[PDB]
Amino acid sequence: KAGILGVGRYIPEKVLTNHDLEKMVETSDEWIRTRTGIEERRIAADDVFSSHMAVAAAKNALEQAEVAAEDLDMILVATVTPDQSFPTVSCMIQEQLGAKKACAMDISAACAGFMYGVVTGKQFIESGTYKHVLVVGVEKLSSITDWEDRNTAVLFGDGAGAAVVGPVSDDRGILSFELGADGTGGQHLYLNEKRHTIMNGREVFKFAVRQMGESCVNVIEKAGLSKEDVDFLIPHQANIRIMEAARERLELPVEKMSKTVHKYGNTSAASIPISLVEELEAGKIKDGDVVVMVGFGGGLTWGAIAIRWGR
Amino acid sequence: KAGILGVGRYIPEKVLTNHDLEKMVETSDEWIRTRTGIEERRIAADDVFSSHMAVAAAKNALEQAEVAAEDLDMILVATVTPDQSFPTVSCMIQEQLGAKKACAMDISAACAGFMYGVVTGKQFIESGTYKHVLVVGVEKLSSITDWEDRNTAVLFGDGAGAAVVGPVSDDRGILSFELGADGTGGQHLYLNEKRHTIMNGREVFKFAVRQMGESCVNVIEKAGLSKEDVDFLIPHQANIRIMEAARERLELPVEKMSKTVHKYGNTSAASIPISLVEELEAGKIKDGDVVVMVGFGGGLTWGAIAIRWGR
Ligand SMILES: CC(C)(COP(=O)(O)OP(=O)(O)OC[C@H]1O[C@@H](n2cnc3c(N)ncnc32)[C@H](O)[C@@H]1OP(=O)(O)O)[C@@H](O)C(=O)NCCC(=O)NCCS
Ligand SMILES: CC(C)(COP(=O)(O)OP(=O)(O)OC[C@H]1O[C@@H](n2cnc3c(N)ncnc32)[C@H](O)[C@@H]1OP(=O)(O)O)[C@@H](O)C(=O)NCCC(=O)NCCS
């Protein structure tokens, strides 16, 4: 069984507060907090790109996993903001990490990308093909934000998270998963000709508030478990109201759902692993815990994983 | 075992001849032919994007496979020229094809992308997770070509190729594969700030002429076969001199190597499946044939597959 051997992240230093944003566009700290839950989000420096953030997250994850870059068989990077289209971020960090035997691709599934990558890595490991797969979710959303558009500029931040995936013992490891998509919703969230993100907020909200809870129940079910068996929920961190609907569907207490949206905003493919590190560092996730992760992104993509933490 | 159930392509109508290119830049039909083997390459219309080409190729492949879009579990699209970064091409055709149950991601490994996708699909099928995986290599290289740069503008064309991957019977199916990368070579082939491809031609040539033959021998070996067992070789169609080195390494006759570079030029991730359709339509590939495919791309990525044709 494939499981998670270690996790790491890179959080940019610069903080953008809601009062910072009150000078940039016509918004209010009150509106942002009440409608999204966001208070702050980090912004990468103009000389910091997805590659920089991804290699930092990756090093932390390799160190925590006790895995040398030399032993990586594959590097997957979920991003829509590579430094450039090619060389990919995965190729770049394969070089900067010294993972010379690893293959490398970038995958594109917007905010669900980390879920696609972890599941892809699982297949390569449980086939016996590969042993160690590095999976990075990284996004410099600030580089594709129209910073004069209040409807999106108060939502996005930058960051990177990474996990080393590999064989784990006994009951441990990824128990079940779900990947999905609906291109019908492509009109509702797209990158335009200016490299500016355009969103029909209300439409994405309606779709996500239904699909995130259903994907969660689906993986619990496929894992042969009950709602009562879930120890922690790590949803995509885009809107506290969407996260709360998922929590309600799983009948989980507040303390069993990761919430970092108030401090990092929506970091797309980086959001789940960033939150995962936060709870691990807080000691809130233990070996043996059944953890449900669920993500939702542009193109209308989604994914979910049930994992039993530990090696 | 996962194998290829059907294949299809989309070839743009507009032909760009070497004499067409003689008016655009300072080149000669003689130089282009002697140094690359290219005579013509197709160019998509200004209103034709990767999504259009990919859906056309995909329909042809579904029809040949006798597979309804409704039954697709996953759509992978290898491209670096999506209509826009998100919605992805895979999401867009998931919609246009009516493949509502399928998940969808785009993967990025430049000219090796189709190989990464097929191998990814194999893992999902041989795990028992999925049954039908659509894999498309599509590129509108004309949209990232500096058409005033002779060093690259005489090399690239547009197109799309697609395969339906699924379980096949007995000895059939993908016998072995290799995926690799070397981010060290990222400096030698990259997309610049103008969305223009920049290449150190001589350096990419040196690397590809060594790696393509070695990847071929590696998959033959892992499949437990000999050079004498190979019935056909489908290399990436970028330079007849690079293809010829691979042929020489495998001691294969001319007639057992696909050559379409003279008519389509380098179409990156689309090149191998386009050539595969060409030989199938010519009747040169039969059920039971051991086919070696090998590709090499920017970021310095590469991949190879040995497959026994048939279902
Ligand atoms: C984007 C989102 C935060 C907006 O919240 P919402 O409840 O949809 O808000 P609405 O779009 O209905 O607009 C509510 C009002 O606030 C206004 N408004 C929008 N952005 C505002 C801002 N930054 N500051 C103040 N008012 C704002 C709207 O114009 C509207 O005013 P009106 O009623 O006078 O026309 C929310 O829909 C969302 O997060 N959607 C899901 C997106 C997701 O899942 N994340 C992935 C994105 S990559
Ligand atoms: C790009 C490539 C066709 C160029 O051929 P090459 O043998 O490397 O040619 P060189 O770069 O050594 O240049 C040879 C000469 O031709 C010239 N030249 C380059 N492009 C030319 C053109 N279009 N027309 C005429 N002369 C040209 C060079 O300036 C040089 O002239 P010089 O000796 O006076 O300086 C070849 O290197 C190649 O295909 N490389 C591999 C790329 C690959 O694998 N494909 C992936 C790309 S996405």
XYZ file of C-alpha atoms and ligand atoms in Angstrom:
718
model
C 0.000 0.000 0.000
C 1.203 3.517 -0.848
C 1.158 6.092 1.931
C 2.710 9.435 2.856
C 6.246 9.189 4.240
C 6.763 12.893 4.970
C 5.394 16.346 4.199
C 6.837 19.854 3.886
C 5.858 23.322 2.734
C 7.167 26.743 1.768
C 5.225 29.779 3.048
C 6.265 33.130 1.507
C 7.325 35.732 4.064
C 5.375 38.719 2.783
C 1.939 39.024 4.391
C -0.932 40.762 2.598
C -3.553 41.759 5.149
C -7.159 42.688 4.391
C -6.334 46.290 5.309
C -3.467 46.207 2.823
C -6.117 45.174 0.283
C -8.471 47.942 1.409
C -6.101 50.454 -0.202
C -5.709 48.428 -3.415
C -9.375 47.883 -4.317
C -12.848 48.849 -3.095
C -13.333 46.196 -0.426
C -13.675 45.900 3.346
C -12.003 43.685 5.919
C -15.563 42.973 7.069
C -16.789 41.751 3.690
C -13.734 39.584 3.041
C -13.949 37.877 6.442
C -17.707 37.307 6.393
C -17.897 35.942 2.849
C -14.660 33.916 2.650
C -13.045 33.690 6.096
C -9.763 35.099 4.786
C -7.764 37.545 6.979
C -4.243 37.255 5.473
C -2.513 35.469 2.614
C 1.155 35.226 1.673
C 2.706 36.654 -1.494
C 5.911 35.446 -3.107
C 8.661 37.920 -3.955
C 9.078 39.094 -7.532
C 12.207 36.935 -7.755
C 10.502 33.891 -6.169
C 8.732 31.557 -8.604
C 6.979 28.218 -8.312
C 10.307 26.457 -8.753
C 11.821 28.194 -5.736
C 8.800 27.429 -3.536
C 8.563 23.851 -4.773
C 12.201 23.010 -4.105
C 11.961 24.427 -0.564
C 8.808 22.420 0.187
C 10.379 19.344 -1.407
C 13.556 19.522 0.701
C 11.492 19.770 3.887
C 9.395 16.774 2.828
C 12.428 14.670 1.876
C 14.061 15.520 5.221
C 10.926 14.599 7.168
C 10.484 11.418 5.141
C 14.182 10.487 5.638
C 14.391 10.066 1.858
C 17.384 11.172 -0.195
C 16.592 12.941 -3.452
C 18.857 10.390 -5.138
C 16.295 7.678 -4.391
C 13.287 9.424 -5.957
C 11.808 7.501 -8.869
C 9.379 10.201 -9.975
C 8.613 13.851 -9.348
C 5.108 15.158 -9.991
C 4.334 18.880 -9.637
C 0.745 20.112 -9.674
C 0.748 23.731 -10.808
C -0.709 26.135 -13.341
C 1.995 28.776 -12.737
C 5.313 27.199 -13.754
C 8.266 29.564 -14.129
C 7.797 28.817 -17.854
C 5.794 26.158 -19.697
C 8.977 24.123 -20.326
C 11.334 23.282 -18.632
C 8.631 22.247 -16.167
C 8.825 22.924 -12.448
C 9.237 19.186 -11.933
C 12.220 19.134 -14.307
C 13.733 22.174 -12.617
C 13.560 20.774 -9.103
C 14.664 17.341 -10.313
C 17.865 19.174 -11.189
C 18.095 21.421 -8.106
C 17.415 18.459 -5.815
C 19.901 16.134 -7.503
C 17.147 13.527 -8.226
C 18.919 12.373 -11.458
C 17.183 8.908 -11.749
C 13.645 10.333 -11.302
C 11.266 11.056 -14.144
C 9.411 14.376 -13.988
C 6.154 15.845 -15.210
C 3.890 18.745 -14.269
C 0.186 18.007 -14.073
C -2.655 20.520 -14.447
C -5.910 20.173 -12.513
C -6.081 23.638 -10.862
C -6.946 23.424 -7.112
C -7.419 19.623 -7.314
C -3.904 19.080 -8.644
C -2.345 17.754 -5.461
C -5.072 15.085 -5.222
C -4.465 14.003 -8.852
C -0.721 13.818 -8.158
C -0.962 11.759 -4.980
C -3.342 9.329 -6.649
C -1.075 9.112 -9.688
C 1.867 8.368 -7.406
C -0.127 5.664 -5.640
C -0.689 3.824 -8.920
C 3.008 3.863 -9.805
C 3.967 2.546 -6.347
C 1.253 -0.081 -5.885
C 2.154 -1.451 -9.322
C 5.654 -2.158 -8.047
C 6.989 0.188 -10.720
C 8.372 2.884 -8.405
C 9.164 3.155 -4.720
C 9.442 6.898 -3.954
C 7.275 9.555 -5.639
C 7.660 13.234 -4.776
C 4.376 15.140 -5.241
C 4.384 18.938 -5.008
C 1.446 21.333 -5.128
C 2.808 24.789 -5.895
C 1.177 27.982 -7.107
C 2.196 31.603 -7.555
C -1.376 32.746 -7.950
C -0.177 36.332 -7.475
C 1.329 36.094 -10.977
C -2.097 35.454 -12.574
C -4.203 37.757 -10.386
C -5.693 40.993 -11.732
C -4.787 43.022 -8.644
C -7.356 45.664 -9.609
C -10.205 43.115 -9.567
C -11.631 42.903 -6.049
C -13.686 39.836 -6.924
C -10.547 37.679 -7.152
C -7.692 39.726 -5.710
C -8.892 39.150 -2.144
C -8.999 35.388 -2.598
C -5.599 34.111 -3.726
C -2.190 33.614 -2.162
C 1.087 31.861 -2.917
C 2.801 28.831 -1.428
C 3.952 25.265 -1.919
C 3.392 21.936 -0.209
C 4.955 18.570 -0.869
C 4.674 14.916 0.147
C 6.898 11.908 -0.382
C 4.721 8.904 -1.281
C 5.950 5.351 -0.865
C 5.111 1.902 0.506
C 3.927 1.854 4.110
C 3.158 -1.018 6.524
C 0.023 -2.964 7.609
C -3.298 -0.969 7.737
C -1.470 2.294 6.847
C -1.666 4.203 3.550
C -4.130 5.562 1.008
C -7.295 3.513 1.496
C -9.408 4.956 -1.308
C -9.696 7.945 -3.597
C -11.886 9.714 -6.123
C -10.876 11.833 -9.109
C -13.476 13.731 -11.108
C -14.058 16.564 -13.536
C -16.839 18.426 -15.330
C -15.721 20.493 -18.324
C -19.214 22.005 -18.429
C -17.977 24.326 -15.694
C -14.990 25.537 -17.686
C -16.807 28.767 -18.507
C -17.027 29.616 -14.788
C -13.290 29.758 -13.978
C -10.619 30.398 -16.614
C -7.375 32.212 -17.337
C -7.963 34.937 -19.894
C -5.719 36.456 -22.566
C -4.074 38.785 -20.019
C -3.082 35.830 -17.814
C -5.804 37.090 -15.441
C -8.102 34.703 -13.581
C -11.804 35.268 -14.325
C -14.364 33.622 -12.064
C -18.129 33.366 -11.732
C -17.854 33.189 -7.954
C -21.469 32.247 -7.230
C -21.456 29.396 -9.771
C -18.202 27.860 -8.515
C -19.554 28.185 -4.963
C -22.780 26.329 -5.776
C -20.877 23.457 -7.471
C -18.164 23.162 -4.807
C -20.621 23.188 -1.831
C -22.313 20.068 -3.264
C -19.342 18.170 -4.753
C -16.919 18.496 -1.816
C -19.165 16.758 0.709
C -20.192 14.073 -1.792
C -16.577 13.291 -2.731
C -15.824 12.956 0.991
C -18.616 10.463 1.628
C -17.594 8.577 -1.500
C -14.048 7.935 -0.294
C -15.172 7.039 3.235
C -17.559 4.540 1.654
C -15.014 3.045 -0.749
C -12.599 2.668 2.163
C -15.263 0.592 3.945
C -15.606 3.112 6.769
C -18.259 5.259 8.440
C -18.398 8.967 9.171
C -17.625 8.083 12.792
C -14.287 6.600 11.663
C -12.889 9.864 10.276
C -10.312 11.436 12.549
C -9.551 14.545 10.520
C -10.733 16.393 7.433
C -8.343 18.475 5.311
C -10.432 20.322 2.692
C -9.226 22.718 0.030
C -8.885 26.077 1.754
C -10.815 28.455 -0.452
C -13.931 29.446 1.518
C -14.858 28.698 5.133
C -18.476 28.402 4.023
C -17.596 25.655 1.528
C -15.395 23.869 4.055
C -18.215 24.062 6.614
C -20.675 22.338 4.282
C -18.222 19.435 3.939
C -17.754 19.303 7.723
C -21.576 19.208 8.190
C -21.943 16.408 5.612
C -19.366 14.312 7.610
C -20.870 15.222 11.040
C -17.373 16.090 12.256
C -16.517 18.532 15.061
C -14.868 21.857 14.302
C -11.622 20.699 15.902
C -11.348 17.824 13.395
C -11.262 20.014 10.281
C -8.125 21.862 9.228
C -8.669 25.595 8.780
C -5.826 27.717 7.449
C -7.820 29.714 4.856
C -7.888 32.631 7.278
C -4.082 32.911 7.141
C -3.065 31.747 3.659
C -6.182 32.295 1.576
C -6.679 30.053 -1.466
C -3.318 28.669 -2.636
C -4.861 26.213 -5.136
C -2.854 22.970 -5.456
C -0.673 23.998 -2.490
C -3.605 24.441 -0.120
C -4.135 20.905 1.163
C -0.463 20.011 1.872
C 0.107 23.393 3.472
C -2.807 22.689 5.837
C -1.544 19.138 6.380
C 1.841 20.448 7.586
C 0.061 22.938 9.855
C -1.881 20.218 11.683
C 1.092 17.891 11.865
C 3.199 20.664 13.402
C 0.362 21.334 15.858
C 0.311 17.627 16.752
C -3.318 17.258 15.692
C -2.722 14.344 13.273
C -1.301 11.050 14.560
C -0.238 7.674 13.211
C -3.396 5.602 12.846
C -5.641 8.599 12.108
C -8.061 8.263 9.207
C -7.605 11.532 7.293
C -9.926 12.639 4.485
C -8.525 15.162 1.986
C -10.799 16.813 -0.584
C -10.043 19.424 -3.198
C -11.955 21.327 -5.927
C -10.530 23.440 -8.800
C -10.871 25.181 -12.115
C -11.798 23.395 -15.236
C -14.120 22.024 -12.607
C -11.864 19.243 -11.390
C -12.104 17.560 -8.009
C -10.541 14.806 -5.973
C -10.542 13.176 -2.565
C -8.453 10.675 -0.663
C -8.957 8.664 2.502
C -5.599 7.835 4.097
C -4.651 6.098 7.328
C -1.746 8.157 8.631
C 1.536 6.411 9.449
C 4.185 4.145 7.925
C -2.411 -6.026 -19.142
C -3.101 -2.554 -20.558
C -2.835 -2.120 -24.313
C -3.969 0.224 -27.081
C -7.563 -0.313 -28.211
C -7.615 2.296 -30.987
C -5.769 5.332 -32.319
C -6.720 8.515 -34.174
C -5.243 11.837 -35.223
C -6.045 15.315 -36.493
C -3.774 16.742 -39.219
C -4.295 20.463 -39.970
C -5.109 21.196 -43.608
C -2.728 24.079 -44.230
C 0.646 22.929 -45.564
C 3.796 24.989 -45.001
C 6.414 23.951 -47.539
C 10.140 24.660 -47.312
C 9.761 27.119 -50.194
C 7.017 28.883 -48.253
C 9.614 29.188 -45.477
C 12.263 30.436 -47.905
C 10.318 33.703 -48.166
C 9.799 34.007 -44.396
C 13.396 33.611 -43.189
C 16.910 33.212 -44.594
C 16.925 29.465 -45.189
C 17.063 26.981 -48.060
C 15.003 23.926 -48.925
C 18.385 22.213 -49.289
C 19.582 23.044 -45.784
C 16.298 22.092 -44.124
C 16.139 18.710 -45.876
C 19.787 17.785 -45.342
C 19.947 18.735 -41.664
C 16.482 17.657 -40.459
C 14.705 15.678 -43.191
C 11.698 18.006 -43.091
C 9.948 18.949 -46.383
C 6.487 20.062 -45.143
C 4.660 20.530 -41.857
C 1.036 21.370 -41.109
C -0.176 24.567 -39.442
C -3.440 24.966 -37.566
C -5.799 27.807 -38.440
C -5.903 30.890 -36.244
C -9.278 29.705 -34.937
C -8.060 26.115 -34.372
C -6.512 25.432 -30.960
C -5.231 22.355 -29.173
C -8.740 21.642 -27.929
C -10.140 21.473 -31.455
C -7.343 19.176 -32.663
C -7.530 17.001 -29.561
C -11.271 16.419 -29.768
C -10.998 15.455 -33.455
C -8.174 12.991 -32.757
C -10.068 11.666 -29.737
C -13.282 10.998 -31.687
C -11.342 9.064 -34.326
C -9.616 7.004 -31.629
C -12.857 6.276 -29.759
C -14.505 5.221 -33.037
C -11.606 2.931 -33.944
C -11.502 1.507 -30.424
C -15.309 0.961 -30.443
C -15.410 2.858 -27.141
C -18.139 5.339 -26.250
C -16.981 8.552 -24.608
C -19.489 7.792 -21.849
C -17.343 4.845 -20.762
C -14.066 6.759 -20.382
C -12.731 6.723 -16.835
C -9.921 9.209 -17.410
C -8.706 11.666 -20.016
C -5.035 12.625 -20.107
C -3.791 15.297 -22.534
C -0.072 15.831 -23.069
C 0.452 19.392 -24.263
C 2.322 22.604 -23.549
C -0.031 24.725 -25.697
C -3.482 24.495 -24.093
C -6.077 26.999 -25.297
C -5.552 28.513 -21.820
C -3.842 27.193 -18.688
C -7.236 26.351 -17.126
C -9.754 25.001 -18.110
C -7.320 22.375 -19.388
C -7.582 20.772 -22.808
C -8.507 17.532 -21.061
C -11.366 19.271 -19.234
C -12.535 20.919 -22.444
C -12.699 17.725 -24.468
C -14.195 15.826 -21.531
C -17.084 18.230 -22.027
C -17.147 18.261 -25.848
C -16.964 14.460 -25.948
C -19.661 13.913 -23.329
C -17.248 11.882 -21.103
C -19.017 13.078 -17.885
C -17.744 10.243 -15.552
C -14.071 10.655 -16.594
C -11.498 12.578 -14.610
C -9.228 14.901 -16.595
C -5.756 16.360 -16.322
C -3.170 17.834 -18.681
C 0.392 16.638 -18.249
C 3.554 18.494 -19.292
C 6.648 16.656 -20.518
C 7.205 18.445 -23.872
C 7.873 15.970 -26.749
C 7.847 12.981 -24.347
C 4.352 13.788 -23.103
C 2.495 11.073 -24.976
C 4.832 8.435 -23.495
C 4.243 9.767 -19.946
C 0.482 9.710 -20.562
C 0.311 6.174 -21.926
C 2.418 4.886 -19.052
C 0.275 6.786 -16.559
C -2.835 5.247 -18.101
C -1.294 1.787 -17.869
C -0.840 2.153 -14.111
C -4.458 3.189 -13.575
C -5.730 0.244 -15.651
C -3.411 -2.490 -14.377
C -4.336 -1.463 -10.828
C -7.951 -2.310 -11.600
C -8.848 1.307 -10.859
C -9.960 2.298 -14.370
C -10.866 0.469 -17.549
C -10.679 3.057 -20.367
C -8.109 5.883 -20.459
C -8.040 8.378 -23.323
C -4.516 9.741 -23.917
C -4.031 12.648 -26.323
C -0.800 14.248 -27.498
C -1.658 17.645 -28.952
C 0.432 20.694 -29.762
C -0.079 23.991 -31.557
C 3.627 24.665 -31.751
C 2.894 27.419 -34.280
C 1.521 29.472 -31.367
C 4.898 29.439 -29.551
C 7.194 29.727 -32.579
C 9.156 32.908 -33.313
C 8.395 32.850 -37.040
C 11.330 35.190 -37.690
C 13.812 32.747 -36.113
C 15.045 30.335 -38.781
C 16.711 28.116 -36.193
C 13.327 26.937 -34.883
C 10.709 28.113 -37.370
C 11.669 25.411 -39.874
C 11.296 22.648 -37.305
C 7.808 22.734 -35.791
C 4.300 21.874 -36.915
C 0.855 21.344 -35.421
C -1.308 18.275 -34.932
C -2.899 15.857 -32.502
C -2.858 12.118 -31.922
C -4.823 10.013 -29.489
C -5.072 6.456 -28.168
C -7.650 4.649 -26.079
C -5.853 2.480 -23.502
C -7.558 -0.447 -21.818
C -7.242 -4.122 -20.882
C -6.231 -6.420 -23.725
C -5.953 -10.232 -23.972
C -3.153 -12.839 -23.582
C 0.394 -11.755 -24.708
C -0.946 -8.380 -25.969
C -0.358 -4.952 -24.402
C 2.371 -2.706 -23.028
C 5.213 -5.051 -22.092
C 7.617 -2.537 -20.570
C 8.397 1.155 -20.447
C 10.907 3.756 -19.337
C 10.315 7.330 -18.196
C 13.227 9.674 -17.572
C 14.284 13.284 -17.232
C 17.360 15.455 -16.745
C 16.656 19.006 -15.571
C 20.319 19.816 -16.219
C 19.284 20.242 -19.844
C 16.572 22.770 -19.064
C 18.834 25.597 -20.206
C 19.005 24.077 -23.707
C 15.288 24.213 -24.608
C 12.841 26.617 -22.958
C 9.899 28.922 -23.570
C 10.953 32.520 -23.063
C 9.046 35.594 -21.879
C 7.616 36.190 -25.374
C 6.147 32.668 -25.480
C 8.908 31.931 -28.022
C 10.788 28.629 -28.039
C 14.561 29.026 -27.607
C 16.781 26.049 -28.369
C 20.461 25.151 -28.327
C 20.003 22.841 -31.300
C 23.428 21.185 -31.182
C 23.147 20.387 -27.457
C 19.667 18.853 -27.719
C 20.896 16.862 -30.730
C 23.880 15.422 -28.849
C 21.688 14.363 -25.880
C 18.848 12.930 -27.985
C 21.157 10.889 -30.308
C 22.481 9.002 -27.251
C 19.351 8.743 -25.064
C 16.869 7.611 -27.740
C 18.755 4.448 -28.676
C 19.524 3.620 -25.037
C 15.881 4.021 -23.974
C 14.931 1.679 -26.829
C 17.339 -1.059 -25.770
C 16.211 -0.608 -22.177
C 12.563 -1.357 -22.933
C 13.406 -4.284 -25.223
C 15.507 -5.679 -22.379
C 12.892 -5.137 -19.668
C 10.325 -6.819 -21.912
C 12.613 -9.875 -22.031
C 13.165 -9.550 -25.777
C 16.004 -9.157 -28.271
C 16.602 -6.631 -31.023
C 15.564 -9.351 -33.475
C 12.110 -9.438 -31.838
C 11.217 -5.829 -32.678
C 8.776 -5.555 -35.549
C 8.521 -1.780 -35.752
C 10.068 1.346 -34.277
C 8.068 4.569 -33.874
C 10.494 7.301 -32.739
C 9.730 10.934 -32.031
C 9.764 12.664 -35.403
C 12.085 15.601 -34.920
C 15.217 14.833 -36.963
C 15.880 12.001 -39.417
C 19.472 11.933 -38.189
C 18.344 11.305 -34.600
C 15.820 8.690 -35.702
C 18.528 6.978 -37.768
C 20.835 6.632 -34.766
C 18.037 4.832 -32.898
C 17.394 2.579 -35.909
C 21.146 1.725 -36.069
C 21.249 0.938 -32.327
C 18.334 -1.567 -32.835
C 19.797 -3.039 -36.083
C 16.397 -2.590 -37.726
C 15.752 -2.158 -41.463
C 14.592 1.167 -42.858
C 11.155 -0.264 -43.619
C 10.611 -1.069 -39.920
C 10.949 2.515 -38.676
C 8.133 5.025 -39.036
C 9.184 8.205 -40.829
C 6.707 11.058 -41.110
C 9.057 13.908 -40.088
C 9.407 14.822 -43.752
C 5.681 15.630 -43.967
C 4.670 16.865 -40.508
C 7.918 18.107 -39.005
C 8.244 18.020 -35.209
C 4.783 18.040 -33.596
C 6.093 17.328 -30.069
C 3.689 15.182 -28.003
C 1.539 14.563 -31.101
C 4.399 13.146 -33.157
C 4.400 9.495 -32.110
C 0.616 8.851 -32.320
C 0.430 10.701 -35.616
C 3.121 8.372 -36.998
C 1.377 5.377 -35.419
C -1.853 6.170 -37.307
C 0.142 6.605 -40.525
C 1.626 3.102 -40.335
C -1.633 1.524 -39.252
C -3.419 3.128 -42.208
C -0.626 1.856 -44.468
C -1.105 -1.642 -43.027
C 2.486 -1.800 -41.796
C 1.613 -2.643 -38.160
C -0.284 -5.845 -37.341
C -1.726 -7.622 -34.322
C 1.142 -9.486 -32.682
C 3.794 -6.952 -33.736
C 6.270 -5.848 -31.084
C 6.334 -2.051 -31.460
C 8.899 0.167 -29.730
C 7.953 3.832 -29.236
C 10.533 6.354 -28.019
C 10.242 10.072 -27.456
C 12.504 12.936 -26.272
C 11.496 16.495 -25.237
C 12.207 19.779 -23.550
C 13.022 20.047 -19.938
C 15.028 17.107 -21.169
C 12.373 14.467 -20.630
C 12.243 11.114 -22.378
C 10.243 7.926 -22.489
C 9.882 4.631 -24.301
C 7.401 1.794 -24.472
C 7.498 -1.732 -25.843
C 3.994 -2.882 -26.797
C 2.688 -6.034 -28.444
C 0.028 -4.761 -30.826
C -3.490 -6.202 -30.611
C -6.347 -6.778 -28.167
C -15.716 34.295 -4.769
C -16.582 34.252 -3.509
C -15.673 34.458 -2.299
C -17.545 35.433 -3.564
O -18.570 35.282 -2.547
P -20.104 35.244 -2.999
O -21.010 34.910 -1.873
O -20.180 34.474 -4.270
O -20.399 36.758 -3.399
P -21.287 37.191 -4.655
O -20.504 36.902 -5.890
O -22.646 36.600 -4.523
O -21.372 38.771 -4.434
C -21.888 39.313 -3.194
C -21.771 40.817 -3.219
O -20.419 41.192 -2.857
C -19.842 41.962 -3.885
N -18.413 41.694 -3.868
C -17.685 40.803 -4.618
N -16.405 40.825 -4.321
C -16.293 41.771 -3.312
C -15.199 42.251 -2.570
N -13.948 41.833 -2.732
N -15.452 43.201 -1.641
C -16.709 43.625 -1.479
N -17.811 43.245 -2.114
C -17.528 42.307 -3.027
C -20.609 41.578 -5.145
O -20.578 42.552 -6.160
C -22.015 41.481 -4.566
O -22.513 42.799 -4.383
P -23.986 43.030 -4.976
O -24.905 42.053 -4.276
O -24.299 44.465 -4.626
O -23.936 42.807 -6.468
C -17.249 32.871 -3.401
O -18.302 32.757 -4.331
C -16.296 31.720 -3.657
O -15.256 31.611 -3.016
N -16.643 30.870 -4.610
C -16.051 29.549 -4.741
C -14.689 29.594 -5.389
C -13.852 28.391 -5.018
O -14.372 27.329 -4.683
N -12.527 28.545 -5.076
C -11.741 28.272 -6.266
C -11.224 29.538 -6.883
S -9.659 29.323 -7.765
C 17.896 22.151 -34.619
C 18.694 21.266 -35.578
C 17.769 20.845 -36.719
C 19.806 22.117 -36.182
O 20.758 21.267 -36.874
P 22.291 21.297 -36.420
O 23.095 20.253 -37.099
O 22.319 21.412 -34.937
O 22.801 22.704 -36.966
P 23.791 23.667 -36.163
O 23.030 24.260 -35.026
O 25.053 22.936 -35.867
O 24.075 24.792 -37.261
C 24.604 24.435 -38.560
C 24.689 25.669 -39.423
O 23.384 25.938 -39.993
C 22.958 27.231 -39.634
N 21.507 27.196 -39.552
C 20.700 27.016 -38.456
N 19.424 27.029 -38.764
C 19.394 27.213 -40.139
C 18.343 27.310 -41.068
N 17.056 27.234 -40.746
N 18.679 27.495 -42.365
C 19.973 27.573 -42.689
N 21.042 27.494 -41.906
C 20.676 27.313 -40.630
C 23.721 27.556 -38.355
O 23.864 28.933 -38.102
C 25.076 26.955 -38.708
O 25.736 27.838 -39.604
P 27.250 28.175 -39.195
O 28.002 26.862 -39.153
O 27.736 29.079 -40.303
O 27.236 28.873 -37.857
C 19.167 20.009 -34.831
O 20.234 20.321 -33.965
C 18.081 19.362 -33.993
O 17.010 19.038 -34.493
N 18.353 19.192 -32.709
C 17.598 18.288 -31.857
C 16.283 18.883 -31.416
C 15.279 17.813 -31.051
O 15.639 16.698 -30.680
N 13.990 18.146 -31.151
C 13.226 18.725 -30.060
C 12.909 20.169 -30.320
S 11.369 20.719 -29.547
